[model samples]
Target: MEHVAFGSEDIENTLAKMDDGQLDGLAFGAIQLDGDGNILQYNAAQGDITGRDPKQVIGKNFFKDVAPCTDSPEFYGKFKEGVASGNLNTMFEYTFDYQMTPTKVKVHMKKALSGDSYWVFVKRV
Candidate 1:
């Protein structure tokens, strides 16, 4: 797989526009989550990457259903900390082996400046 990288600034800019084309144009997976961890925005590429149905995943808690692999302290904990602090900007490499096949991915989270939400960017490594 091709290596893809995204930073908090990039996510901030893209989310500011809130354009579907801009999101779908990304070469990786993009997920927008509310402060409560419910999915607000999800791209088609993400569905293909995670082997999940968009209809079922959207409106669900990302840390619980869509990506249970990240429900641990290391992942979800960091996310919660960021949300609570209102300054979450993090990135790391992770391995996912939940309902889908094992896949190595890079995860990036950035808190939105406009609201109580954050963006999660994932790219296969």
Candidate 2:
């Protein structure tokens, strides 16, 4: 079986010690997706911004986090195109109300060392 070096439990503990102030300022969930767009890794900073736990978001499709606002074919289809085309640096901004506030999310993706995956760095504002 292939191996993933990142461990969720280890990540959680490391994150817990980070300054809460820094965590509060984060704008989006830092999500990592495989080439197939399946969520592989997410961080607490992202979970707090989205008001959803990583457990609920990880292993799920990036666009289907119970928010139909992002379920449109245009959004996903275009994203898929960029991923397939070897567009190493892809970025977009979006707004959604996770807790009744207009939250902005910036999604940027880069291909990972493993050719089968891409790492998405997210920021919320």
Candidate 3:
């Protein structure tokens, strides 16, 4: 299943080089968000995992419209704090149950050093 470490170096570059099919081939979810937490890119696996259509999530604010469950102190709070501090590298286990059934997953949030972008990598726990 090609499990990747949350602390992998240059993960943003690795994902940027991959196509949709290549990303969907992995047994996990890949979501790319802008500095404002707007969904810029979301793989098919992420759609399936979250039971949300790409049409519904893409172009929307992830921490607001799509995944408000994570907008709390534990999730979005850390995100904001990290971005402000210039070091947004976090990995932890979280449960997702916004629209679909609850599911336990490991979440990895990484900030791109070259740009104001973020990547969220999710894998079933």
Q: lDDT values of the candidates? A: 0.81, 0.58, 0.80
Which pairs in model 3 have colliding backbones?
none
Better of 2 and 3 by lDDT: 3
| Residue 118 lDDT (model 1) | 88
RMSD of 3: 2.2
Query: What is candidate 2's lDDT per residue for 1-125, written digit by digit as tens?
Result: 11212222233333334343443343444566776678877767676666777767668777765454655654566567767786555567777664457787776655654456665556664
TM-score of each model, in listed order: 0.88, 0.62, 0.86
* Each candidate's clash count: 0, 3, 0
Model 2 whole-model lDDT (C-alpha atoms): 0.58
lDDT of 3 at 100: 82
Model 2 misplaced stretches (Cα beyond 4 Å): 1-28, 65-67, 98-100
Reference-based lDDT, residue 102, model 1: 97
Candidate 3 residue spans exceeding 4 A from truth:
1-7
Ranking 1 against 2 by lDDT, winner: 1
lDDT by residue for model 3 over 73-118, one digit each (tens)? 9889988887787778889989998878999999889886467788
For candidate 1, write residues 18-104 as lDDT tens digits. 566567766778888998999988877788888887667779998877788899888899999999888988889998899778999
**Residue range with the least summed lDDT across 10 consecutive positions in model 2:** 1-10
Ranking by lDDT: 1, 3, 2
| Model 1 per-residue lDDT at 51 | 87
